[PDB]
Amino acid sequence: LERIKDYLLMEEEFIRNQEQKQEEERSKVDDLRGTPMSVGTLEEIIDDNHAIVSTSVGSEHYVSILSFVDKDLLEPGCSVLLNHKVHAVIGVLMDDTDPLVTVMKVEKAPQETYADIGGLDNQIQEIKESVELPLTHPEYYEEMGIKPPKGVILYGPPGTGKTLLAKAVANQTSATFLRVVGSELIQKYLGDGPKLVRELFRVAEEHAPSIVFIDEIDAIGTKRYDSNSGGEREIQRTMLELLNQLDGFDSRGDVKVIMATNRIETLDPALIRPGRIDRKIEFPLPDEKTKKRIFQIHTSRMTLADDVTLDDLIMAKDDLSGADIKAICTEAGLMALRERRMKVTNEDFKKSKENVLYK
Amino acid sequence: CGKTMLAKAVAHHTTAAFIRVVGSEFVQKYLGEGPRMVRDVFRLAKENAPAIIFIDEIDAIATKRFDAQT
Amino acid sequence: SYDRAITVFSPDGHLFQVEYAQEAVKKGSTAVGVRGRDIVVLGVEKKSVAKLQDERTVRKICALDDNVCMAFAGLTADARIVINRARVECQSHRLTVEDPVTVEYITRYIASLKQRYTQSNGRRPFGISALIVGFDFDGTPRLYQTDPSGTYHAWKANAIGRGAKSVREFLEKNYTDEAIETDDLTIKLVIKALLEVVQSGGKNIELAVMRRDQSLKILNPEEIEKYVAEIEKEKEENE
Amino acid sequence: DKQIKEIKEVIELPVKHPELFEALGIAQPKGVLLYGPPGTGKTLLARAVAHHTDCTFIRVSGSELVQKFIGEGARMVRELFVMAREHAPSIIFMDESEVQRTMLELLNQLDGFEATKNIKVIMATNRIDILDSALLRPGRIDRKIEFPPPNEEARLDILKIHSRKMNLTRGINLRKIAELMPGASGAEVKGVCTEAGMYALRERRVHVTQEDFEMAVAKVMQKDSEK
Amino acid sequence: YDRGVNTFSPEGRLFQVEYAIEAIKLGSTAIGIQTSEGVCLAVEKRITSPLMEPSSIEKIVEIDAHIGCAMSGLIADAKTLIDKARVETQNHWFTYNETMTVESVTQAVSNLALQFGEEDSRPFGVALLFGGVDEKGPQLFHMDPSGTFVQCDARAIGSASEGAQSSLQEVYHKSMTLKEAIKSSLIILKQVMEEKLNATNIELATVQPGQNFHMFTKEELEEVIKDI
Amino acid sequence: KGVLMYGPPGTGKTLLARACAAQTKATFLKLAGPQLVQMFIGDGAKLVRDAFALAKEKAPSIIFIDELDAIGTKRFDSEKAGDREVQRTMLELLNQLDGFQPNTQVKVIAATNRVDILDPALLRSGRLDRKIEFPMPNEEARARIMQIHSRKMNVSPDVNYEELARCTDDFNGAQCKAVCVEAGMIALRRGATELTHEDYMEGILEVQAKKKANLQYYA
Amino acid sequence: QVEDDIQQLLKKINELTGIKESDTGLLAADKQTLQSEQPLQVARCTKIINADSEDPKYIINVKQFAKFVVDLSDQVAPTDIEEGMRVGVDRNKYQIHIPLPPKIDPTVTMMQVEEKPDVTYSDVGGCKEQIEKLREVVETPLLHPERFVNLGIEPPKGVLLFGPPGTGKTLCARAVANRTDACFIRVIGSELVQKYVGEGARMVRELFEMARTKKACLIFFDEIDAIGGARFDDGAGGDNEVQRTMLELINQLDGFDPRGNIKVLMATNRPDTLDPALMRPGRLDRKIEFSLPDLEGRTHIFKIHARSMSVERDIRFELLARLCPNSTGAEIRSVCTEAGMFAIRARRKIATEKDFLEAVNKVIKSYAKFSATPRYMTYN
Ligand SMILES: Nc1ncnc2c1ncn2[C@@H]1O[C@H](COP(=O)(O)OP(=O)(O)OP(O)(O)=S)[C@@H](O)[C@H]1O
Ligand SMILES: Nc1ncnc2c1ncn2[C@@H]1O[C@H](COP(=O)(O)OP(=O)(O)OP(O)(O)=S)[C@@H](O)[C@H]1O
Ligand SMILES: Nc1ncnc2c1ncn2[C@@H]1O[C@H](COP(=O)(O)OP(=O)(O)OP(O)(O)=S)[C@@H](O)[C@H]1O
Ligand SMILES: Nc1ncnc2c1ncn2[C@@H]1O[C@H](COP(=O)(O)OP(=O)(O)OP(O)(O)=S)[C@@H](O)[C@H]1O
Numbered sequence A: 001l002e003r004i005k006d007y008l009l010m011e012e013e014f015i016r017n018q019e020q021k022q023e024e025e026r027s028k029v030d031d032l033r034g035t036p037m038s039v040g041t042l043e044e045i046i047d048d049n050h051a052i053v054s055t056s057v058g059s060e061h062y063v064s065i066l067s068f069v070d071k072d073l074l075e076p077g078c079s080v081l082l083n084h085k086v087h088a089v090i091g092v093l094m095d096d097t098d099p100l101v102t103v104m105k106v107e108k109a110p111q112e113t114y115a116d117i118g119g120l121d122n123q124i125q126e127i128k129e130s131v132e133l134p135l136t137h138p139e140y141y142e143e144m145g146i147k148p149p150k151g152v153i154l155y156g157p158p159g160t161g162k163t164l165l166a167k168a169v170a171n172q173t174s175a176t177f178l179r180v181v182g183s184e185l186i187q188k189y190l191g192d193g194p195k196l197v198r199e200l201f202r203v204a205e206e207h208a209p210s211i212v213f214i215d216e217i218d219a220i221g222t223k224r225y226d227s228n229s230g231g232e233r234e235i236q237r238t239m240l241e242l243l244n245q246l247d248g249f250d251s252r253g254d255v256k257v258i259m260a261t262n263r264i265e266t267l268d269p270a271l272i273r274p275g276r277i278d279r280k281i282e283f284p285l286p287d288e289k290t291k292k293r294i295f296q297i298h299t300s301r302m303t304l305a306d307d308v309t310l311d312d313l314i315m316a317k318d319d320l321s322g323a324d325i326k327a328i329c330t331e332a333g334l335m336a337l338r339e340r341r342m343k344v345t346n347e348d349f350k351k352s353k354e355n356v357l358y359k
Numbered sequence B: 001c002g003k004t005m006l007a008k009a010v011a012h013h014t015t016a017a018f019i020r021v022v023g024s025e026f027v028q029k030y031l032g033e034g035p036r037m038v039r040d041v042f043r044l045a046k047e048n049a050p051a052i053i054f055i056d057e058i059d060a061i062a063t064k065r066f067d068a069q070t
Numbered sequence C: 001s002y003d004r005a006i007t008v009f010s011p012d013g014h015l016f017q018v019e020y021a022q023e024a025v026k027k028g029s030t031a032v033g034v035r036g037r038d039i040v041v042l043g044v045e046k047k048s049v050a051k052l053q054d055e056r057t058v059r060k061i062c063a064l065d066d067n068v069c070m071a072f073a074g075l076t077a078d079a080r081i082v083i084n085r086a087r088v089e090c091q092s093h094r095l096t097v098e099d100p101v102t103v104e105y106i107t108r109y110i111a112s113l114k115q116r117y118t119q120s121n122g123r124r125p126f127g128i129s130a131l132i133v134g135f136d137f138d139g140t141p142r143l144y145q146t147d148p149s150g151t152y153h154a155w156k157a158n159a160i161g162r163g164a165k166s167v168r169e170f171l172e173k174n175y176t177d178e179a180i181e182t183d184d185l186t187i188k189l190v191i192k193a194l195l196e197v198v199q200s201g202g203k204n205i206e207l208a209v210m211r212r213d214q215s216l217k218i219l220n221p222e223e224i225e226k227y228v229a230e231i232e233k234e235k236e237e238n239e
Numbered sequence D: 001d002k003q004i005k006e007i008k009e010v011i012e013l014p015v016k017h018p019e020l021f022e023a024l025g026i027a028q029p030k031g032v033l034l035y036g037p038p039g040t041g042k043t044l045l046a047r048a049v050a051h052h053t054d055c056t057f058i059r060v061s062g063s064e065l066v067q068k069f070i071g072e073g074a075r076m077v078r079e080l081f082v083m084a085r086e087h088a089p090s091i092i093f094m095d096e097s098e099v100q101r102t103m104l105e106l107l108n109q110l111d112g113f114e115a116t117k118n119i120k121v122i123m124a125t126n127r128i129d130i131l132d133s134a135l136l137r138p139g140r141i142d143r144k145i146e147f148p149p150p151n152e153e154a155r156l157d158i159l160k161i162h163s164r165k166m167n168l169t170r171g172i173n174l175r176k177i178a179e180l181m182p183g184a185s186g187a188e189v190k191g192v193c194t195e196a197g198m199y200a201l202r203e204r205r206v207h208v209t210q211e212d213f214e215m216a217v218a219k220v221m222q223k224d225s226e227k
Numbered sequence E: 001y002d003r004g005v006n007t008f009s010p011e012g013r014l015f016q017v018e019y020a021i022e023a024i025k026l027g028s029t030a031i032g033i034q035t036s037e038g039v040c041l042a043v044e045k046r047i048t049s050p051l052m053e054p055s056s057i058e059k060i061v062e063i064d065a066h067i068g069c070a071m072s073g074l075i076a077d078a079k080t081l082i083d084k085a086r087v088e089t090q091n092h093w094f095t096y097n098e099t100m101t102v103e104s105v106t107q108a109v110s111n112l113a114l115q116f117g118e119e120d121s122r123p124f125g126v127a128l129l130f131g132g133v134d135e136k137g138p139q140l141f142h143m144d145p146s147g148t149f150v151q152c153d154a155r156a157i158g159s160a161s162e163g164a165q166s167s168l169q170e171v172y173h174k175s176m177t178l179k180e181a182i183k184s185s186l187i188i189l190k191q192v193m194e195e196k197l198n199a200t201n202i203e204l205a206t207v208q209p210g211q212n213f214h215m216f217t218k219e220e221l222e223e224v225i226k227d228i
Numbered sequence F: 001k002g003v004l005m006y007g008p009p010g011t012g013k014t015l016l017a018r019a020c021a022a023q024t025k026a027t028f029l030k031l032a033g034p035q036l037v038q039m040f041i042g043d044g045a046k047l048v049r050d051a052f053a054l055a056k057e058k059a060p061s062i063i064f065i066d067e068l069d070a071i072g073t074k075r076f077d078s079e080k081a082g083d084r085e086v087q088r089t090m091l092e093l094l095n096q097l098d099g100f101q102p103n104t105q106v107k108v109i110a111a112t113n114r115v116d117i118l119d120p121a122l123l124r125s126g127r128l129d130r131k132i133e134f135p136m137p138n139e140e141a142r143a144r145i146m147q148i149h150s151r152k153m154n155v156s157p158d159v160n161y162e163e164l165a166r167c168t169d170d171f172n173g174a175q176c177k178a179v180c181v182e183a184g185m186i187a188l189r190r191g192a193t194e195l196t197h198e199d200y201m202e203g204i205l206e207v208q209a210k211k212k213a214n215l216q217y218y219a
Numbered sequence G: 001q002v003e004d005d006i007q008q009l010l011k012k013i014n015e016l017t018g019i020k021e022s023d024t025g026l027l028a029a030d031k032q033t034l035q036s037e038q039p040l041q042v043a044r045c046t047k048i049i050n051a052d053s054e055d056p057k058y059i060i061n062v063k064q065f066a067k068f069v070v071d072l073s074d075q076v077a078p079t080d081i082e083e084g085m086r087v088g089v090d091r092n093k094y095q096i097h098i099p100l101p102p103k104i105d106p107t108v109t110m111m112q113v114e115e116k117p118d119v120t121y122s123d124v125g126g127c128k129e130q131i132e133k134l135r136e137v138v139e140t141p142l143l144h145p146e147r148f149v150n151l152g153i154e155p156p157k158g159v160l161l162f163g164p165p166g167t168g169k170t171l172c173a174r175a176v177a178n179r180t181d182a183c184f185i186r187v188i189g190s191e192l193v194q195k196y197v198g199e200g201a202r203m204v205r206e207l208f209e210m211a212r213t214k215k216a217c218l219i220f221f222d223e224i225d226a227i228g229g230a231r232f233d234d235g236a237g238g239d240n241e242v243q244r245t246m247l248e249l250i251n252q253l254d255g256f257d258p259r260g261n262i263k264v265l266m267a268t269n270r271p272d273t274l275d276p277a278l279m280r281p282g283r284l285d286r287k288i289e290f291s292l293p294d295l296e297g298r299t300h301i302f303k304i305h306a307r308s309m310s311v312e313r314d315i316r317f318e319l320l321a322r323l324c325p326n327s328t329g330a331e332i333r334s335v336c337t338e339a340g341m342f343a344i345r346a347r348r349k350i351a352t353e354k355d356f357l358e359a360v361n362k363v364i365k366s367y368a369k370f371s372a373t374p375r376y377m378t379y380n
């Protein structure tokens, strides 16, 4: 019976939250402000309620401030509001929006969940207990006062499901996802690596609890590009900036970091020390049992003609991955809709096997 | 290898209007006068006649690498 | 010749190539072996055959004497070299002392060769790990394993190859003295251990035994099929 | 025509009927790779099919002019997707280690994980063995499409297309012209037509006869030994 | 960055020998104690598995009928040296009708503790404790990979040698007896080992002028352990 | 026309510059090396020429350059890449120094740590006239330097500098100053007021910068 | 319920009760003061070239407009209008009013620390001599200029640190930055790498501008290998801008009027590719190094990471330390946390010894193939 009184008083508090002369004061603030509100740029701040700004041409002025908005929302390199007639600081401007953010932040529910992963069951609980169970259930760690594991390296041969695992963590989540392929840290201008790194982790630390997933980072060392300045003596400095940004100073925060490689032996081991990355997880070519789950799930949504056996396909290649399985399970469908059919026969799989593997 | 020698002979034997252009002449001190000079050359070219433009050394212009900061 | 030292110590106290050549063993086929008290048994798993070809040349279990038996892991070529040298050594021992060659001698020879092989000038260490099962005088079954370091090291059951931790964990919860009471049960115990290992289709299950007063018998893969069938029958009888 | 059927089945079929794929329940494809000798139709096929299926053709290869039109030139290359979300039925196409890196970022986005569909990628290159093995994971590219050098009937069709703009003459044998070519490219027959026009022009004539074509064949086969 | 293996240091030592002195430290512990009644000695086996049959691991091996030994860390580099040391003691008793004293044994070993090279390969990786009873009474001897051989009255090696040397200098003096030193060693053992001390973990080796040969079969170890 | 210093990095070359500043009452003019490096193309030449002009109009003019190798770099003809503008500033320095329109009112002192970096036109023989090498302090000079830097500190007068100089092998003057100062602070560790010879010994042991790792088992 | 409904009633009673003052009382918190700031001035800032004689007669470059000859107003001091001084100048009559601090290049403003990360000296135990020496250099002259004056010495104005990675360098720096009391200024070594030639030089200039303005401050350099280590000279012209940045770092550090009340701490992982101009003392005096914690260090670091966690205190820690011969504190931290994570596999509230043994054979023996220090102990 607490619903009635609680709802009445809570709605009164919500209507008093909207209940916060007065219109005359709004008109006076509008009188102080000019109508063509010009935009400036801070350079420094002087503590006597007037500071230096910088116009769009370069002219700079010691101007006072119309102090009702929080001026302490502003730092060097900020955007202000200025007048034409006296150039005074009209007030704060909300921040410009947001090409790096909109590019590097995955906004949407991004694909299928753990119902699609093919029989791992042990790697999954490790990445679960490193990201999901810490973040979504932050109650066990209080009991033991143990900080969560920081970094997770996924590695293994190509085709095993690093990308799937990242997408599945990004499915069931509560944090902002940040995706940068590691090959975008090689720029044709000098000194552009550390700028990308500092902007990336600035975005991460300013926005939210987050997951920064950095994929195929091993290609930063074993791929020299002609579209570059002096290669290795800039790449090394970029790696050093990534290093210092990852485990440097000033209370790192609520940022999770997951990285994924093909090869691991060409990495500078200074990233691979603990304190930065605590979990290193192998992804092997699985077995001949969880392959049945992979063929099953990648044939779970199709009109499979039951004259085929999946054990004919398991035995076929001795070191096939889930990449090969997806490739055959889609190429057989491409052979199916080539001849206006619905169900898929055995020779479709035969042609798909002879198309994917041996070409 | 005799590059401008042939444009010289073409300027001699022709009847058409012939406009020589220094390559680096477009980039100048005042802002925006370059594209305006491009407009100038092409408006006069459209005006005159069946005509011939020779622009020497467009390596001053066509450089495949830029820097949109400077 | 090649005046160089391939294998250098680490800055933190290792031999890179001895500890690292164990990985080549770690990425080979699995093989177990136990001793009963009167019948010895061993066998390899994961032949990973093409199911449609010859199989008399891929035999991973051989013998050096009429008394001693082999198994290995890792890569097969170094095993071929070590087996050739071991055959020569055991027969040369028979040249001298008129006994049948003791198993402890041939394991010391293999481990000694392996260590002076790792020590020497520019020779790459042997990335294998053998199993040497034999029952010398007065019928005593014993079994030793090797290591790329060269440490002969007597066990009671085996744990090598791929996923040896799982297999030794099954042998850990399966150390029953009852299992080595019935020779047939010891054979079935190897079959159940290797069944708690890989596919174990009854195709790559190559096993050979010796009843210590005979030579090695390679079993025809229909008897192993009935062994797996009665193992599945006992597994149904567990419920 | 077979390559036409392939690109039909892989691009026109997702656009006009997504629910065929979603009824059969596989991944709708996202990648096409074109190979062959350079000069055999690597561009016209892609541009043409993208024109007929009503998709905004986009060819971003390597300029900085392009890097000013897309964004402000600041940091990366992914802002093409920001301009591609606004014209969602669109196709991205490229020429020949840089462009392969570009394709790596492109595919690494739209391999199931970037957006709603209607965005695809096409590379045209030559000599498949010169590219990355990490690109050659079989779960990465969906179709690989061959362009053979043209045959007698193929060059005949090419000639009967490119001859349709000239001032020809009756009683001309085109199959002789096609069967004097040493398996030329799809680019060079257009050169034969243009040089035939030039040879007719220098005679102060208005029609084009077979002599001009045969001398153009001689000219192009003389240019074939230039590098 | 791979330099030549026979390079000294910027500070002075070498490299590879120093890395050998580091490589000792991972090995199992051992404790030997000189007493005028005779030399006693102890070791830990470090049993890993129950499948691992325990009586086959050798730590105390036999050089002569009166010269004992114990090894550490790498097993098989030690096995070569043990074999060769035996051969050279047999050469001495043969060509001299007398017993090669323990110091002369260890001089013969550390003559080629460092002959590591590319012509005429790596340094060996074992620390050794040498005992026995020569004419100079009991002797306890300790060498290293660097050949820097010294006499020690009661040296403890390997992984737990810091607290072993410290707590050993706590309990040791000059006029100890045998059995007191035996239990004084195994107290230190079951303070420095990890597993429960029982019949299968450790093994002793004592050689006396009276108890003429080093002889130590099983289950007197049981009687010694139940005396704790 | 001009004097160059060069040598090992701790023999002291800033010292003579500050010395001649302390003694000669001309317009002594300092110039750091990379201060002639500019971002905008064509300001380093302006900077060099303005420096020489302000030297000329204050006619007794001693111009000091420190680390001339910052702008002094051996040129090269390559493609696709290459530093240019710094060589332009270097050529401006050369020509406004020597060549056309010579002068008698300029005095130039340069000092690099390494010699082989420079273009031969920088030195040629009339740009920087007197090549002056600096050696390491031999025996007595080390004792002289340590005796100089021990001046303000209260030395107990039972300290033989000869022992110190004969055991400080292959040091510079800066390392000798480091020896003396760290000896003072090692004496300040135990809190004793005036120094002792053992403090100097331990200061030498600290300046040598051993990296051990516990070497004890010798002899 | 009763607390919830009664707190809703009380808080909303205060809210709807002050609503009477909200609807009865009819920004202006500064409005009259801001309109008295309307007789104030726009005050454009400038830069001064020089003065003239017998009179003020000042000469100014504004920034872009022109250069004007001006006069001072009456509310100034005729002294502190020296050359190269950013002063605020009237827009109408062009007259100087107030001198100000110079240009600071605001991308350099954001590397002063402005906070204090909480790292105590207790977190680096087992490194007592290193803590002692670094204390002696950094802490003691800023808090006690007593022994250093009454005996007549100068403290070493520079200290470099090195060792294997993950050994405590960063952590010791933060431990100082807790109890610093000075203007601690962070510098990442990659901050001096910009697109344009000689730009990082100007960054170093502005660093020492800030350093000379504020007395008794600290500057921390971090991973100085990016700043520049060697002057490898070839017929290619490769790494050179970094080299000029390094030389400008040399000269404005120490030489020809030295630095003042500033102390520099550098920290590298590979102190071997360094030009010996940095190795000259007078710039980088004490070579404090971090080796591995030998035996008792790891016992103490187990006491550090174990003192505030749920364990079973009946176990020992020495046996845990005896299995970690070449290991860093980072690996110790991973051992402790991973033993906790094995306790999360079951549902317990206290660790076991077996949990720590799982942690040891999980971290050390398994990931010892990577292990980060078989090729940095040699300082490659
Ligand atoms: N274990 C698996 N179970 C099911 N499908 C799998 C599995 N592994 C891979 N796949 C398939 O492979 C695709 C994901 O590719 P990945 O294996 O993650 O490629 P990748 O090799 O990780 O690429 P990288 O990270 O650059 S090497 C999915 O669309 C699946 O169809
Ligand atoms: N037939 C000829 N072949 C070569 N040189 C000739 C010929 N006739 C005259 N010359 C002379 O050589 C010059 C040829 O060079 P140019 O015509 O200037 O070519 P170009 O302008 O120098 O090309 P550049 O060097 O790349 S800008 C002529 O200007 C004449 O002085
Ligand atoms: N199917 C065709 N039949 C006849 N001519 C063709 C055909 N396709 C292309 N051409 C002509 O040949 C030229 C070159 O063909 P493209 O389609 O551009 O291939 P491509 O651009 O040469 O491939 P590259 O050079 O490796 S990027 C075109 O500009 C057309 O004039
Ligand atoms: N007579 C002397 N000989 C050598 N060094 C001395 C002498 N007197 C003082 N010093 C020390 O020399 C130091 C100056 O060394 P530096 O000037 O740094 O070396 P350098 O000559 O400048 O080489 P750089 O730095 O490449 S220009 C001073 O700090 C003094 O402590």
Ligand SMILES: Nc1ncnc2c1ncn2[C@@H]1O[C@H](COP(=O)(O)OP(=O)(O)OP(O)(O)=S)[C@@H](O)[C@H]1O
Pocket (backbone or CB within 6 Å): A247, A270, A275, G123, G124, G125, G126, G127, G164, G165, G166, G167, G168, G169, G170, G171, G172, G268, G269, G293, G301, G304, G328, G329, G330, G333
């Ligand atoms: N001696 C130590 N005692 C206690 N904790 C330590 C010790 N060394 C390292 N740690 C812990 O491990 C972390 C890593 O040390 P850091 O100094 O941050 O590594 P680092 O200085 O970044 O090394 P790099 O990679 O060469 S910059 C520290 O922040 C501590 O949490």
